[PDB]
Amino acid sequence: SYDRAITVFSPDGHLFQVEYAQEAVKKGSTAVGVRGRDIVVLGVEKKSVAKLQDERTVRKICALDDNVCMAFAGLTADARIVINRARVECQSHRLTVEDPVTVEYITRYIASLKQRYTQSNGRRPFGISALIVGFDFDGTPRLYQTDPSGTYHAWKANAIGRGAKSVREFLEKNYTDEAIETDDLTIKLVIKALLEVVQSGGKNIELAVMRRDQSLKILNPEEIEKYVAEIEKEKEENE
Amino acid sequence: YEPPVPTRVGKKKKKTKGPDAASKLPLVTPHTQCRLKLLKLERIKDYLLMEEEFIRNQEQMKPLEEKQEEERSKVDDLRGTPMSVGTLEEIIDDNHAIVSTSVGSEHYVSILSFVDKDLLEPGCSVLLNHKVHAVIGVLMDDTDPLVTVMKVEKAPQETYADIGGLDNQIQEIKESVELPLTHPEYYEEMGIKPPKGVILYGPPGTGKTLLAKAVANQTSATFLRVVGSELIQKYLGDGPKLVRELFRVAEEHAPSIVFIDEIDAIGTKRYDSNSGGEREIQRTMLELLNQLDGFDSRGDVKVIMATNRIETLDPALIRPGRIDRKIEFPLPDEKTKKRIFQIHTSRMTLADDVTLDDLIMAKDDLSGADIKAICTEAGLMALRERRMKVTNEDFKKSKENVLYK
Amino acid sequence: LDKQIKEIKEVIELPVKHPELFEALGIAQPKGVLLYGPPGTGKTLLARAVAHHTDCTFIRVSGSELVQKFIGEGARMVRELFVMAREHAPSIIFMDEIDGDSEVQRTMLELLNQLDGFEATKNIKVIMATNRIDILDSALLRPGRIDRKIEFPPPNEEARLDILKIHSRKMNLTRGINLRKIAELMPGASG
Amino acid sequence: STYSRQIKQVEDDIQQLLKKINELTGIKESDTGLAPPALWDLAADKQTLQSEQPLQVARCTKIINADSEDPKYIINVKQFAKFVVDLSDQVAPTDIEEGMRVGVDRNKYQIHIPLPPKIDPTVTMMQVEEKPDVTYSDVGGCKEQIEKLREVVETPLLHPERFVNLGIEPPKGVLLFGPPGTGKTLCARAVANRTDACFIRVIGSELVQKYVGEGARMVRELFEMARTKKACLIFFDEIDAIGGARFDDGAGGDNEVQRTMLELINQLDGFDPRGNIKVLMATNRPDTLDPALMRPGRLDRKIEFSLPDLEGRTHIFKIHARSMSVERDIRFELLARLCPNSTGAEIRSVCTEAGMFAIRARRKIATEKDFLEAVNKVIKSYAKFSATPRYMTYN
Amino acid sequence: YDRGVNTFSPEGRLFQVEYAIEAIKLGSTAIGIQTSEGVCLAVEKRITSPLMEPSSIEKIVEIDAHIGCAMSGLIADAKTLIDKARVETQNHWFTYNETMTVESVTQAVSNLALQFGEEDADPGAMSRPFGVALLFGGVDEKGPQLFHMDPSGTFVQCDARAIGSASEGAQSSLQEVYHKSMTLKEAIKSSLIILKQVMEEKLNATNIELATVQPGQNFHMFTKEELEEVIKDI
Ligand SMILES: Nc1ncnc2c1ncn2[C@@H]1O[C@H](COP(=O)(O)OP(=O)(O)OP(=O)(O)O)[C@@H](O)[C@H]1O
Ligand SMILES: Nc1ncnc2c1ncn2[C@@H]1O[C@H](COP(=O)(O)OP(=O)(O)OP(=O)(O)O)[C@@H](O)[C@H]1O
Ligand SMILES: Nc1ncnc2c1ncn2[C@@H]1O[C@H](COP(=O)(O)OP(=O)(O)O)[C@@H](O)[C@H]1O
Ligand SMILES: [Mg+2]
Ligand SMILES: [Mg+2]
Ligand SMILES: [Mg+2]
């Protein structure tokens, strides 16, 4: 058994392996999640869309359960382990409690699993950040973010990936009660957020929405293209 | 017997070099064409008018032996011909010094009165009388061949307009190498010394040298360029000696900008000619540490370093105080890649069937060097077919040449 | 090497003789050439030929300390060669890798960096000859440094006949020699 | 614009007058190193060229029959020849000793004047002639460090009476060690500014020489020239260049540099007394130094420049933001708290970048937000390149 | 690197332990005051974005109905320590039918510190110290009691202890304001004055956490309305 301390404290008091895992998060696709009134929107930028790539396989938005879905940023192979481990726990929680998992619970389990890899022998930290969105049993929309360190916080809106700082700065200015009055405005908010870092346009945007008492709905490219026209249309009248 | 004691404080020469000498007229203000400036201008003229009359009267009654052209003629007689070139080994006294001729024989000779005594420093080239070897002048040292290598005599033709997408990078680099010289008042009114050092790091081809070339084009200061691999020498101590001499040329040509391009190449490449191994490179680095931020006071020297491997550098080399700013040069995005293609295809004549949007996605990890290499090879393909207009087929065969194979 | 002669002309001959062709095309004049192939395939033969035909001074940089007294008493940088290269423009600086890290490759980088945009005088071209192209540094293999890489494959049956036809003229040959058969008798041979 | 015509008229006359003045006075040449004619004593120079004969530099080797009234001196005239000569009648016999350079005439080679010992020009340039512009007031958070530094390198020379009366031999060596940017060279620059004795700055990489035994030679001549002064200070910046620990790697790894370190160790504490030299070495890699060099009697005091504490960091912030155009209520204690383990070099950069953001926004006063952004850019964003984490293990 | 986790410095310092202590100085400031009327625990949430929900930043935790903990340093690391404290308590209750003393809870958690190593360890053993400092506060037989834990496993009763980024400044402020005979309402106020002086942001009822364990009464986190009542003064 490989029993070695990968993550150790630097003399300043930093866990450098955790910081390096957070550096891999900054090299991933920009994932944007906005918590609306009755909808949760997850938006992920697509890296170098190839006409020969099956878009079904490389999907950064996956459903842990019927009411919880997450989008990641970082190492794709690292994330798929976390999603599978989270998926198994969602079914274990449902078997014991006979109640669908809460977003707080599965973001706590993923964060605890991520933290365990920053303090366990022979294991390097998970190099992904998760944007977990979903709905509780009482219909409250919840949006949570985890980092490789293991810290989870609830966000009204957040961005992870390479352009997280730019999108988050954009989100802090445009996230208002009026901007999430309707589902369509909430979906436009993520597209407006992702247009700040996506250069080409809607062809590099993957959108997944989840409504209350509904399953995760991946938005087709035609539906996304319809939205970007509206934002482009609304840009003209504001000039 | 008692040892002679100098009246001059120390053994080094005067720091000031290349001044206006006695032509240092008082700085008259304001520069506006007003009466106060006219009154001050007349004021300087009045004293000169007195000066001209006073000096003429003395020389008029001065003895025929003591005349400006006669004393100069007597100086040549005192100097004699030929005028031997020696080396100043020690300044024993104000008018006495130990000098060595080219044959290695030292002499205890007398420094004559007409010698510029404030140019005297140990190791300097002194002019000696052929017969009595007395110090009779100091040879203004010719520009070393080592000086000519660092100095970029002609500013490169690359401007900031030829750089696309590095708007923040230009802005950060300007504020440490350009803004402090053009508008030094901004830093003085704020009470801050300008950012001391700057390092440009990123993937290869991202424009690190290009921004330095743009800096060298629009700089009033001397630009010295040295590749990091040039600091690996074939002899012990020469590497540290060269780093010491490089910043010595920077001191003389103040204000100056020293560009240590490919600084990481000093350690990431091992050459058998380097007698000392990694240990001599470490001593070369330790000399570089002192020059960037050390005991000796640094004049108006701004240091630019460039590297595509910043993780391999000694962390103490790029610490704040030595290199204040660490400007990153990422691979271009779609907006920047289009600008780079426009920059390098501007002087081209293109065909109507060529489109830069398709050329944007030639490769995901596309750098500006690859973009430029596509263009020049595309033009070379057109040159082969005796054409001036570059077609899309030329660009297609261009991508398969530079990006692949 | 008829194909290779054309390739090297478009990069070393045309920029010197016709700078206006490149200015009209709007492309930068080429400055770096790399000739790669098995030893004895004509890389040094072709590099000297172009310098001879273009009236460009041919300078071979072997890094020899025996020639350092001519380069300059300093000898601290190989860029001290540029002083004598500028004085003899047009010039061709040729280094051949005989094959720690490679000093010829190190010299190539230092010359190419100065020749990038930091050199005032034009018409100073630089050639590198190497046995293999995959051993090259990532810095030299980076696009934009070496503007053309010319391959020198070992001569085939027909090319060996031409090389045989060239060197046999310097001998008193009996009439009727079947140089074609001798060429067929030397598979995979260098010039 | 009304005076434009007349200003050029008087400006040209001044230039014409200036050139005319240079015609009579003489301001020219300056490439053969000719001094301005105001200092030309031609009458004296003619007398010196005859009255004062030139003297060839020679080294006395042996005195033969020094007891008798005919003492004969063997001299080595550099590369010329060796001569058995007698002493001149205008110098005392007791003034010439064996092994001392002398000045001899060209006719009979009789010794005319003793000469100072030969010192390498590079070693001569090592002594500081212009003091730095840094005082102890520019070093913050090093209160205990400075007092220890001053009471060994400053107090004995300023007030030597307080140590002779009590029979106290003050330490003659201080080693400053700490991570980069902690103020090691800053304190030595303050020492040179304040000191009144001779200060010699020696960088360890300067002692690395091409030839065998040359580096140890420069250490010998360095201490030889330091001993020609009543009190002296030698600063060895980055002593890890030559002070590395001795080892045997089969081949002659670092054998030459170890000899230079062995020479430095010999001069500090060997058979001979060192003198009134008080050495001072700074290194960010003290773990690499040889145990013999790190021993009392060579480096008696080991002053550690650790990263400043909260009080020290607030003091360094006050030092570097003293001349800034800061706002009213800059919470410098808060800024010191935002960089827990940060060198004083980072604090200075934080101050520079804080005012650099204000220049960016065309603002003449630096706000607290500018410092907060500067801390993020320096302490946080530039933490990838931080030399601190790797160098605290070394110190 | 070459050094292992269980390596001693030449000065007798466990390198990893000393390094983990430096991690607290990057954590948020937490102030704990022990009074005769109860224990006070305050901590700054340190919001970095208006889009972050302040309620999700849980830096004060219910260890049990009679004891709570305030954490500073690496928040993710204290979850492992908090979980056992919530497991060790309810294990004392299972075996002894009584609430575990605050000192014993801190003693049990302290044993987890230094239970780290590279070799000859269980598969579930940790690899590095817990880079967090805990401020346990609760009520037991000995009345109100405040205990401070550090990554070295060293726990001690403290009358008023401040941990975090501003431990030095707040502790000095605490010494000037703490007297043994003072009310808990004074402790709530005095801790909030010190916090407002050390916080980067402006102090309000959303960026702080207040908790109290009075005798008789249970562990009580202060709500927004309760916090605004004491914030309105100072
Ligand atoms: N952002 C850019 N805008 C315009 N031209 C660019 C840009 N980036 C690169 N180029 C082009 O690429 C050429 C080669 O790149 P350059 O010499 O600047 O590389 P570098 O960043 O210094 O990298 P390295 O030395 O690691 O290869 C330049 O001469 C320039 O024409
Ligand atoms: N205690 C301090 N007080 C004020 N300014 C300081 C202090 N320490 C460092 N600085 C600033 O940081 C700079 C760092 O340079 P310094 O010569 O002090 O570094 P050093 O400790 O010798 O580093 P190195 O080990 O890399 O040689 C100084 O020039 C000074 O401006
Ligand atoms: N293709 C060729 N045609 C004619 N002669 C050749 C050819 N290749 C090699 N040679 C002969 O071989 C000799 C050395 O070849 P050289 O050019 O040094 O090989 P390389 O290309 O490896 O440098 C030359 O003098 C030349 O006469
Ligand atoms: Mg470059
Ligand atoms: Mg060959
Ligand atoms: Mg230093």
Curated annotation (Swiss-Prot), chain B:
Disulfide bonds: none
Cited CDD domains: RecA-like_PAN_like
Residue positions where Phosphothreonine is found in the record: 29
Main subcellular location: cytoplasm
Top-level taxon of the source organism: Eukaryota
Cross-link Glycyl lysine isopeptide (Lys-Gly) (interchain with G-Cter in ubiquitin): residue positions: 213
GO terms of molecular function: ATP binding; ATP hydrolysis activity; proteasome-activating activity; RNA binding
Residue span of region Disordered: 60-80
Location relative to the cell: Cytoplasm; Nucleus; Membrane
Biased composition regions of type Basic and acidic residues, renumbered to the chain: 62-79
Key words of the record: Acetylation, ATP-binding, Cytoplasm, Deafness, Intellectual disability, Isopeptide bond, Lipoprotein, Membrane, Myristate, Nucleotide-binding, Nucleus, Phosphoprotein, Proteasome, Ubl conjugation
GO CC field: cytosol; membrane; nucleoplasm; nucleus; proteasome accessory complex; proteasome complex; proteasome regulatory particle, base subcomplex
GO biological process per UniProt: proteasome-mediated ubiquitin-dependent protein catabolic process
Residues bearing the modification N6-acetyllysine: 234
Residues making up the signal peptide according to the UniProt record: none
Membrane topology: Lipid-anchor
Binding residues for ATP: 202-209
Subunit structure and binding partners: Component of the 19S proteasome regulatory particle complex. The 26S proteasome consists of a 20S core particle (CP) and two 19S regulatory subunits (RP). The regulatory particle is made of a lid composed of 9 subunits, a base containing 6 ATPases including PSMC1 and few additional components. Interacts with SCA7. Interacts with NGLY1. Interacts with PAAF1.
Protein family: Belongs to the AAA ATPase family.
Stored PANTHER family: 26S PROTEASOME REGULATORY SUBUNIT (PTHR23073)
This protein's name: 26S proteasome regulatory subunit 4
Species annotation: Homo sapiens (Human)
UniProtKB/Swiss-Prot annotation, chain C:
Subcellular location: Cytoplasm; Nucleus
Role description: Component of the 26S proteasome, a multiprotein complex involved in the ATP-dependent degradation of ubiquitinated proteins. This complex plays a key role in the maintenance of protein homeostasis by removing misfolded or damaged proteins, which could impair cellular functions, and by removing proteins whose functions are no longer required. Therefore, the proteasome participates in numerous cellular processes, including cell cycle progression, apoptosis, or DNA damage repair.
Gene (name only): PSMC5
Family per similarity comment: Belongs to the AAA ATPase family.
In-chain residues carrying the UniProt-annotated modification N6-acetyllysine: 69
Subunit relationships: Component of the 19S proteasome regulatory particle complex. The 26S proteasome consists of a 20S core particle (CP) and two 19S regulatory subunits (RP). The regulatory particle is made of a lid composed of 9 subunits, a base containing 6 ATPases including PSMC5 and few additional components. Component of a complex with USP49 and RUVBL1. Interacts with PRPF19. Interacts with TRIM5. Interacts with NDC80. Interacts with PAAF1. Interacts, in vitro, with the thyroid hormone receptor (in a thyroid hormone T3-dependent manner) and with retinoid X receptor (RXR). Interacts with ERCC6.
Binding of ATP, residues: 37-44
Protein name as it appears in the record: 26S proteasome regulatory subunit 8
Region (May mediate interaction with PRPF9): 33-191
Range covered out of full length: 154 to 356 of 406
Organism listed in the record: Homo sapiens (Human)
From Swiss-Prot, chain D:
Induction (record text): Expression is not cell cycle-dependent and occurs throughout the cell cycle.
CDD domains for this protein: RecA-like_PAN_like
List of residues that carry N6-acetyllysine: 78, 384
A Pfam match: PRS7_OB
Any one GO CC term of the record: cytosol
Disulphide linkage map: none
Keywords: Acetylation, ATP-binding, Cytoplasm, Nucleotide-binding, Phosphoprotein, Proteasome, Ubl conjugation
GO biological process, one term: ubiquitin-dependent protein catabolic process
Keyword Ubl conjugation assigned: yes
Chief subcellular location: cytoplasm
Subcellular location field: Cytoplasm
A GO MF term: ATP binding
Keyword Cytoplasm annotated: yes
Binding residue positions for ATP: 178-185
PTM comment, free text: Monoubiquitinated by RNF181. Phosphorylated. Dephosphorylated by UBLCP1 which impairs PSMC2 ATPase activity and disrupts 26S proteasome assembly.
Complex formation: Component of the 19S proteasome regulatory particle complex. The 26S proteasome consists of a 20S core particle (CP) and two 19S regulatory subunits (RP). The regulatory particle is made of a lid composed of 9 subunits, a base containing 6 ATPases including PSMC2 and few additional components. Interacts with NDC80/HEC; this interaction is detected only during M phase. Interacts and SQSTM1. Interacts with PAAF1. Directly interacts with TRIM5.
Similarity section: Belongs to the AAA ATPase family.
Protein name: 26S proteasome regulatory subunit 7
Biological source species: Homo sapiens (Human)
Gene behind the chain: PSMC2
UniProtKB/Swiss-Prot annotation, chain E:
Signal sequence residues: none
Top-level division of the source organism's lineage: Eukaryota
A GO biological process held by the record: proteasome-mediated ubiquitin-dependent protein catabolic process
Pfam families, sorted: Proteasome, Proteasome_A_N
Cell compartments where the protein resides: Cytoplasm; Nucleus
UniProt entry keywords in alphabetical sequence: Acetylation, Cytoplasm, Glycoprotein, Nucleus, Phosphoprotein, Proteasome
Modified residues (Phosphoserine): 9, 49, 56
Protein task: Component of the 20S core proteasome complex involved in the proteolytic degradation of most intracellular proteins. This complex plays numerous essential roles within the cell by associating with different regulatory particles. Associated with two 19S regulatory particles, forms the 26S proteasome and thus participates in the ATP-dependent degradation of ubiquitinated proteins.
Assembly behavior: The 26S proteasome consists of a 20S proteasome core and two 19S regulatory subunits. The 20S proteasome core is a barrel-shaped complex made of 28 subunits that are arranged in four stacked rings. The two outer rings are each formed by seven alpha subunits, and the two inner rings are formed by seven beta subunits. The proteolytic activity is exerted by three beta-subunits PSMB5, PSMB6 and PSMB7. PSMA5 interacts directly with the PSMG1-PSMG2 heterodimer which promotes 20S proteasome assembly.
Protein name as it appears in the record: Proteasome subunit alpha type-5
Organism in which the protein naturally occurs: Homo sapiens
Lineage: Eukaryota, Metazoa, Chordata, Craniata, Vertebrata
